[PDB]
Paper text:
The packaging of cargo transmembrane proteins into [name]-coated vesicles entails a direct interaction between [name] protein and cytoplasmically-oriented ER export signals. About a half dozen export signals have been identified to date, almost all comprising short peptide motifs, all of them binding to the Sec24 subunit of the [name] inner coat. The ΦC export signal was identified in studies of p24-family and ERGIC-53 proteins, and comprises a C-terminal signature of a pair of hydrophobic residues or a single terminal valine residue. The ΦC motif contacts a site on [name] that is also the binding site for the LxxLE- and DxE-class export motifs.
A series of ΦC-signal peptides was synthesized, based on a core sequence of yeast Emp24p, and individual peptides were soaked at high concentrations into two crystal forms of human [name] protein: one comprising [name]/[name]•[name], the other Sec24c. For all ΦC sequences, we observed clear evidence for peptide binding to a site on [name] in the [name]/[name]•[name] crystals, based on the presence of residual electron density that matches the peptide sequence (this binding site is occluded in the Sec24c crystals). (C) Residual (Fo-Fc) electron density (2.6 Å resolution, 2.6 σ contour) for a bound ΦC peptide containing the terminal Val-Val motif of human p24β1. Thus, specific recognition of the ΦC motif involves the terminal carboxylate group bonding to Arg750 and Arg752 of [name], with the penultimate hydrophobic residue of the motif nestling against Tyr496, and the terminal hydrophobic residue fitting to a pocket of hydrophobic side chains.
Numbering used by the authors:
A (entry chain A): 3 to 205, 225 to 464, 476 to 537, 541 to 723, 746 to 764
B (entry chain C): 1 to 23, 29 to 130, 148 to 157
C (entry chain D): 7 to 11
D (entry chain B): 346 to 464, 476 to 662, 666 to 882, 888 to 1093
The structure:
């Protein structure tokens, strides 16, 4: 079963290809409508593989150096193995002299196509956490932020290093643990500093980065005593908030102290940057923060200059190997658009809300520090992804949270896509859900993913995934290829390409031309007869995924603020397939007396009066009460013991909502609305050129017409 | 915004208490002393005077004038509420000693209450005339 | 600077 | 008295055994009984020469020395609704005006007739007191009276931490926190600095003070708007906790460089909005940032007279402080060269004062430890005036042309005094611009407008009246030898900076030559008038003082600090330092001022400063003003050792002896009575050390024997012989 094949391969290898049978010829490789690409999850969790405390065995060929994998032909009599990439024959290392057929190494068993090694040779480096705290916010917001930071401090490993940087009009770098005084280095938030300058001005641990077990008591007291920025805010003015200099001072601090080691720069902002490099809006309250409409008419003089400042900090932190998180809570826009490259280039998180004093932010912030079945954070640091392919395969590029290492080889393709021109990428921060998208090109086929990263325990680890897909038989080329089409993976991989072009500017024109092309090659139709058009079960859902994608908030940036568009795209560019489909096409469940909860179509015809709907959009959990149920619930029938069945109906969507309102890392916003309610708009906009029915008729007309 | 504050006996313009922090001041402290000289028993008890980019506000209670200067963009509603807080406190503490003192600034130590009241207004967290006509 | 002293 | 002529070669014992009293101006009995106290205001020539030509013939400098803010026994305070002043030259009505129509008074400085306001007018206190204080009205102030603001700036480099000065300074502040002049408006702040600049925030809402490090040395700023300069009354507990914590913060410091300049720039910005007193404590050469100073090699006894500031940074900064009513006091506790010749400018031009503690160390130098403690006690508790201007007026025809002291001379001879302290002395040189043929009396009036520590504008006015004479003899008969010596020392200091030390020394010798040669050409030996019988003695003492001495092992900062004292101390302490009083104190007896109720107070005779007047069989006390040194002879009597020193033999007198014991012997009671009497006559507590033993390698006691010859200077007799050779050349 091809579905069982796709399911078991993502469970084992954390990968999903657009095509599982690849073009064996050059004539069919160029003619592929959707490129051969892979949704790859390097640190995907699975039912307990034993970590292999072995140095990975390598092909003794200079260029290749691939890892011993189940595709290698072995010879247990002659103690030799042949590399499946370069055909080199290798001798086994001394520690493998005793291997036999009835007791062979794990990396050769097919169940271990994806496997993790532990490299224990150097002394382990402590983790590093740098708090960068805005003080230009209301007391209730700041007090809640202080408590959230104090809570996170009680979760950190005893050996991890911590430092504190607070900012407002000035930037303060706190020297922790000084006794009886508590000193800090104050800098103007008006000019930037380089790492070198900051090192000379400031003069394994530091004065500024101390181990938790040595400093957790003093830091807890310091975080407790943090107060507002002492500088008054005159009437009709915004506070002077030097976000750009504070972030650059945090980046420069770690750059000259612990370069090339896992560190987390966690920045908490309560508003936009109003002073200094990186400025997003002026200090005049009469001037609103720029909107998307303000962007398209050149009425935003801070955007391009502010974006450039944070792109320089993003590449600085990513070259050094450090992570940048942005936790932004305010009632107005905060500038995520200009700062998005810091958590995007690094593997950092982007959390946005209305206020730090909510369950939404507090619960989202503590899920950052979720541990696994050993008390260890689900974080990885300094991830180096290296992809080794067969000679017939070349890597076009990657789209996702990563940076290029600019390493060359015969696996690099001239056609670069996203972050291309390399067979190596650095991912400063990965989680078990981090999902990259690697686009390939043809010029059993094999590809090997080698991800070296620093575990939250400090252990150096190497995850090796080796997959193989069949070359299409020449006598049944396009038929075997058509049967191996992953319509869900291809939609997300094409969506990744579409979002990347809009965010680096029409994109809908490219998305339509490929949908129509895919219909003509893999559909069934008589010429100039739209009603004759059919799609096999393999392709039937692709147009619907394409309909919701082109109308989504990922490509229709208006009706949202620029910060919201950058937040939505940020999380889509990192998620696996399952969550990505939910973003593009929210799932809808229906609740009524006439049966158990059932999934229903995202169309206005699903909005019934005697039904409760639960819509999950990934960012939102929405419960809609129909007009009949709304009146029944406004009446008071629930409290009466006669209608305990009406209690089940009102609590059934709430219960199902609670479960997913805990696993999701960016905790979704919860909405309890009904017919006539204001918040019912979110359901009416995701639901229903115009409608899907009209959209399909237009597609069939063009598919059966010109090529 | 920012300002200057003065308390003076209306009869002779004798200064009673003030408060000034620069880091100009000379042109508007002079204009303030002109007003104190002009004010008498027939002057309006509550007034606002326009000084271009700056704006004076005063009240007169018990022969004592409470004057404040601020940039023209400071809320007129808050300028008079600041003068009432000073007047109620000053009249309570020294209201009965005012018509007897003869030294200038016989209540310098009222500086303390002024600046602590002042900081509760320049932090968001009746009549109108021209000062140049009156002078 | 000028003074009355 | 004495119109008699004196031959200095046959006397040689000219120094009187009793203290020198200032000359009485030859005025009418009723005019003189109102004259200003000569400790506050005195002239080099009590008989003013009528013309400039007569003044030039006398070859003596004409000038005034004044101590205007001196602590007084009684001060008449006039609170009049109007200050009566002359309509033309703004002279305050004073006892030396002329009433004619009884409703009209004639100004004694410009002769303009004025009208007396409806407010026996000659019985008014303004006409009965030469020294008086006025309450100033609103026209005498540019802004509301400023509060008291005390900012303390401490060097915390590695050298400074090693000296341990920070401990006693913080302890003195704690002990004297309630004695700081001021009321509830008093503000206080603190800054430490090394290679960076450290502020200190003090809020009752926080567990502990906050140290805010400004590291941008090229671009200093104020890190916090509030809570750096805090109200002392409210935040008393917060200030006290900081003074107890500061000495413990920099114990293991490795910072060796000091950015004094940028720290003073930051301290200036912090005090700019209000003004006040800045107390700077520095221990080494500034070597980092603006105001850095190059090292210099110290001179030895071998280098000739081959002084000035190395930069104008601290002079410019001092002028910026003066404009914002900020005075800067400098405490230099350096063990090596620190270029005081450049650092002193921060205090000269801001009306501050400098204090020098050479080789200060908490363990190794106990004398400087106690000297700093006593000077800090006076410095923190004495009265203070803020944002002060002083004007000095004199009768038409007389013109001040050169000012001396710590201030900034504004246009039209206004003296800007960001602070005024009761221990400061000033000097002025004048000339006869128009012949005084009209009058027979001329007056001099100093007016000090200032803000008291209670926020009250006040004017202190002193008026001096002197007669005018027209003969050379009358000029000489009225000469004040001490005042002339003081003015010449201030002129020789300026000559050192302007020309050289050689020219300064020569002009001091030439002033004695030219004065007595002019006296000679208007009458065998060396003939001087009675009033100038000590003129060569005091000038010789001036030339052997640390300010002008030559062939000594004196170091750069020592000499500059000696000149800073010449420019800043009152006349009496310049005389006490230059020519200390020497007494024999092992044989005291009660012919003393035994009048003071229950105390006897011996009055031993003053001795001439020569080793010939000493004796190995006794003990001698030297009052140098700021210090008392009790030298004990090697063959001293057993009575003095056991009954005064509390010691059984000369060998067991402790090497550094910080003071005498108060034993239960009548000999001890006599010497404690005599020392207590000396100290009550001044306010900076002079430390007494008896450590001057024949072998304590600290017998610089002998350096004050200014009459004896040395390997690099003349004796008093040799000096007299050189004067006579040049007088009749
Ligand atoms: Zn190989
Ligand atoms: Zn006159």
């Amino acid at each position: 079963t091809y579905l069982e094949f796709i399911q078991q391969n993502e469970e084992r290898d954390g990968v999903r290809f657009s095509w599982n049978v690849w073009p064996s010829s050059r004539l069919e490789a160029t003619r592929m409508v959707v490129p051969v690409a892979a949704l790859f999850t390097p640190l995907k969790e699975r039912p307990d593989l034993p970590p292999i405390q072995y140095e990975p065995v390598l092909c003794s060929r200079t260029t290749c150096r691939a890892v011993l994998n189940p595709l290698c032909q072995v010879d247990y009599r002659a103690k030799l193995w042949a590399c499946n990439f370069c055909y080199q024959r290798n001798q086994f290392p001394p520690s493998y002299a005793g291997i036999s057929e009835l007791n062979q190494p794990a990396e050769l068993l097919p169940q271990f196509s994806s496997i993790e090694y532990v490299v224990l040779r150097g002394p382990q480096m402590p983790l590093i956490f740098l708090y960068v705290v805005d003080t230009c916010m209301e007391d209730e917001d700041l007090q809640a932020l202080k408590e959230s930071m104090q809570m996170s401090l009680s979760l950190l490993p005893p050996t991890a290093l911590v430092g504190l940087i607070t900012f407002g009009r000035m930037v303060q770098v706190h020297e922790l643990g000084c006794e009886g005084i508590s000193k800090s280095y104050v800098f103007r938030g008006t000019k930037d500093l380089s790492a070198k300058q900051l090192q000379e001005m400031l003069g394994p641990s530091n004065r500024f980065l101390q181990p938790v077990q040595k400093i957790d008591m003093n830091l807890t007291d310091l975080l407790g005593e943090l107060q507002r920025d002492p500088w008054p805010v005159p009437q009709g003015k915004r506070p002077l908030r030097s976000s750009g200099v504070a972030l650059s001072i945090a980046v420069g601090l770690l750059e000259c102290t612990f370069p090339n080691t896992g560190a987390r720069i966690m920045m908490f902002i309560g508003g936009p940057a109003t002073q200094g490099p990186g400025m997003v809006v002026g200090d005049e309250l009469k001037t609103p923060i720029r909107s998307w409409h303000d962007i398209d008419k050149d009425n935003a003089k801070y955007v391009k200059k502010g974006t450039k400042h944070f792109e320089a900090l993003a590449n600085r932190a990513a070259t050094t190997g450090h992570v940048i998180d942005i936790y932004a809570c305010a009632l107005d826009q905060t500038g995520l658009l200009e700062m998005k490259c810091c958590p995007n280039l690094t593997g950092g998180y982007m959390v946005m809300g209305d206020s730090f004093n909510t369950s939404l932010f507090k619960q989202t912030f503590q899920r950052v520090f979720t541990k696994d079945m050993h008390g260890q954070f689900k974080m990885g640091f300094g991830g180096t992804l290296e992809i080794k392919t067969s000679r017939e395969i070349k890597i076009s590029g990657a789209i996702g949270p990563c940076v290029s290492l600019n390493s060359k080889g015969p696996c690099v393709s001239e056609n670069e896509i996203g972050t291309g021109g390399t067979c190596q990428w650095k991912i400063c921060g990965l989680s078990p859900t981090t999902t990259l998208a690697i686009y390939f090109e043809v010029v059993r086929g094999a590809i090997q993913f080698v991800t070296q990263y620093q575990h939250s325990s400090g252990q150096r680890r190497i995850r090796v995934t080796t997959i193989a897909r069949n070359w299409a038989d020449a006598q049944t080329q396009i038929q075997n290829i058509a049967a191996s089409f992953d319509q869900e993976a291809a939609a997300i991989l094409m969506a990744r390409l579409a979002i990347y072009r809009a965010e680096t500017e029409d994109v809908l024109r490219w998305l339509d031309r490929q949908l129509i092309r895919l219909c003509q090659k893999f559909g069934e139709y008589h010429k100039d007869d739209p009603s004759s058009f059919r799609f096999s079960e393999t392709f039937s859902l692709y147009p619907q995924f394409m309909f919701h994608l082109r109308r989504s908030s990922f490509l229709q940036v208006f009706n949202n603020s620029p910060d919201e568009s950058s937040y939505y795209r940020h999380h889509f560019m990192r998620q696996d397939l399952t969550q990505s489909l939910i973003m593009i096409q929210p799932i809808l469940y229906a609740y009524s007396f006439s049966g158990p909860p059932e999934p229903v179509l995202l169309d206005s015809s699903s909005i019934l009066a005697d039904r409760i709907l639960l819509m999950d959009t990934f960012f939102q959990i929405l419960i809609y009460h129909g007009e009949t149920i709304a009146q029944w619930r406004k009446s008071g029938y629930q409290d009466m013991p006669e209608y305990e069945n009406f209690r089940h109906l009102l609590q059934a969507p709430v219960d199902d909502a609670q479960e997913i309102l805990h696993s999701r890392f960016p905790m979704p916003r919860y909405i309890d609305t009904e017919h006539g309610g204001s918040q019912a708009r979110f359901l009416l906009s995701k639901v229903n050129d115009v409608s899907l029915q009209v959209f399909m008729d237009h597609l069939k007309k063009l598919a059966v017409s010109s090529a | 915004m920012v300002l200057l504050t003065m308390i003076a006996r209306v009869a002779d313009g004798l200064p009673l208490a003030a408060s000034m922090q620069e880091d100009d001041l000379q042109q508007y402290q002079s204009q303030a002393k002109q007003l104190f000289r002009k004010l008498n028993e027939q002057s309006p008890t509550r007034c606002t005077l326009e000084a271009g980019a700056m704006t004076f506000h005063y009240i007169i209670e018990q022969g004592v004038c409470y004057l404040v200067l601020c940039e023209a963009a400071f809320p007129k509603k808050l300028a008079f509420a600041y003068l009432e807080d000073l007047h109620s406190e000053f009249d309570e503490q020294h209201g009965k000693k005012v018509p007897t003192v003869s030294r200038p600034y016989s209540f310098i130590e009222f500086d303390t209450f002024i600046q602590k009241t002042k900081k509760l207004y320049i932090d968001s967290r009746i009549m109108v005339a021209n000062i140049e006509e009156v002078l | 600077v000028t003074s009355v002293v | 008295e004495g119109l008699r002529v004196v031959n200095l070669l046959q006397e040689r014992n000219m120094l009187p055994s009793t203290p020198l009293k200032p000359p009485v101006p030859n005025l009418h009995e009723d005019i003189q009984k109102l004259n200003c106290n000569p400790e506050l205001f005195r002239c080099t020539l009590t008989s003013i020469p009528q013309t400039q030509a007569l003044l030039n013939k006398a070859k003596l400098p004409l000038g005034l020395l004044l101590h205007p803010f001196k602590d007084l026994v009684q001060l008449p305070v006039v609170t009049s609704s109007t200050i009566v002043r002359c309509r033309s030259c703004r002279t305050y009505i004073n006892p030396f005006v002329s009433f004619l129509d009884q409703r009209r008074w004639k100004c004694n400085l410009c002769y303009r007739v004025n009208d007396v306001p409806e407010e026996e007018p000659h019985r008014r206190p303004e006409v009965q007191n030469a020294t008086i204080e006025f309450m100033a009205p609103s026209e005498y102030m540019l802004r509301p009276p400023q509060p008291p603001v005390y900012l303390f700036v401490f060097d915390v480099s590695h050298n400074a931490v090693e000296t341990g000065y920070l401990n006693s300074v913080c302890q003195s502040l704690l002990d004297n926190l309630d004695l700081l002049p001021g009321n509830t408006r008093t503000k206080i702040g603190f800054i430490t600095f090394d290679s960076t600049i450290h502020f200190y925030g003090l809020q009752e809402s926080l567990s502990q003070p906050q140290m805010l490090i400004v590291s941008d040395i090229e671009d200093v700023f104020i890190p916090m708007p509030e809570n750096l300069l805090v109200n002392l009354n409210e935040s008393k507990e917060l200030v006290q906790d900081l003074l107890k914590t500061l000495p413990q913060m920099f114990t293991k410091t490795l910072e060796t460089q000091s950015a004094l300049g940028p720290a003073l720039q930051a301290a200036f910005k912090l005090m700019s909005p209000t003004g006040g007193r800045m107390s700077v404590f520095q221990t080494q050469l500034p070597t980092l940032g603006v105001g850095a100073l190059k090292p210099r090699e110290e001179p030895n006894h071998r280098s000739s007279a081959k002084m000035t500031p190395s930069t104008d940074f601290y002079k410019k900064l001092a002028l910026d402080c003066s404009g914002q009513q900020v005075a800067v006091d400098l405490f230099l506790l350096s063990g090596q060269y620190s270029d005081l010749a450049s650092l002193g400018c921060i205090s000269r031009y801001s009306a501050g004062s400098v204090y020098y503690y050479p080789s200060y160390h908490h363990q190794h130098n106990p004398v400087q430890v106690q000297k700093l403690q006593k000077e800090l006690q006076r410095y923190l508790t004495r009265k203070i005036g803020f944002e002060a201007v002083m004007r000095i007026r004199c009768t038409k025809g007389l013109s001040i042309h050169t000012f001396h002291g710590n201030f900034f001379v504004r246009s039209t001879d206004l003296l800007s005094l960001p602070n005024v302290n009761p221990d400061a002395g000033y000097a002025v040189q004048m000339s006869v611009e128009e012949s005084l043929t009209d009058t027979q009396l001329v007056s001099f009036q100093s007016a000090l407008l200032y803000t008291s520590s209670k926020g009250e504008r006040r004017i202190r006015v002193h008026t001096l009246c002197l007669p005018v004479v027209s003969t050379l003899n009358d000029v000489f008969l009225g000469a004040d030898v001490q005042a002339i010596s003081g003015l010449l020392a201030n002129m020789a200091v300026d000559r050192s900076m302007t020309a050289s030390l050689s020219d300064a020394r020569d002009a001091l010798v030439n002033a004695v030559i030219d004065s007595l040669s002019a006296y000679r050409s208007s009458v065998p030996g060396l003939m001087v008038p009675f009033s100038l019988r000590l003129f060569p003695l005091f000038v010789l003492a001036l030339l052997k003082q640390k300010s002008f001495q030559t062939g000594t092992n004196a170091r750069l900062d020592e000499r500059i600090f000696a000149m800073c004292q010449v420019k800043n101390q009152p006349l009496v302490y310049l005389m006490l330092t230059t020519h200390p009083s020497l007494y024999r104190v092992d044989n005291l007896s009660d012919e003393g001022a035994l009048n003071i109720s229950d105390r006897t107070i011996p009055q031993p005779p003053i001795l001439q400063l020569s080793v010939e007047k000493l004796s190995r069989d006794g003990a001698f006390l030297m009052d140098a003003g700021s210090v008392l040194m009790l030298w004990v002879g090697k063959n001293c009597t057993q009575n003095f050792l056991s009954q005064v020193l509390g010691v059984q033999n000369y060998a067991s007198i402790p090497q550094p002896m910080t003071d005498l014991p108060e034993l239960d012997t009548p000999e001890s009671a006599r010497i404690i009575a005599f020392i207590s009497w000396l100290r009550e006559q001044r306010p900076f507590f002079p430390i007494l050390y008896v450590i001057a033993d024949e072998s304590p390698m600290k017998a610089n006691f002998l350096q004050n024997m200014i009459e004896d010859r040395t390997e690099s200077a003349l004796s008093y007799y040799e000096f007299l012989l050189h004067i006579q050779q040049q007088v009749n050349k």
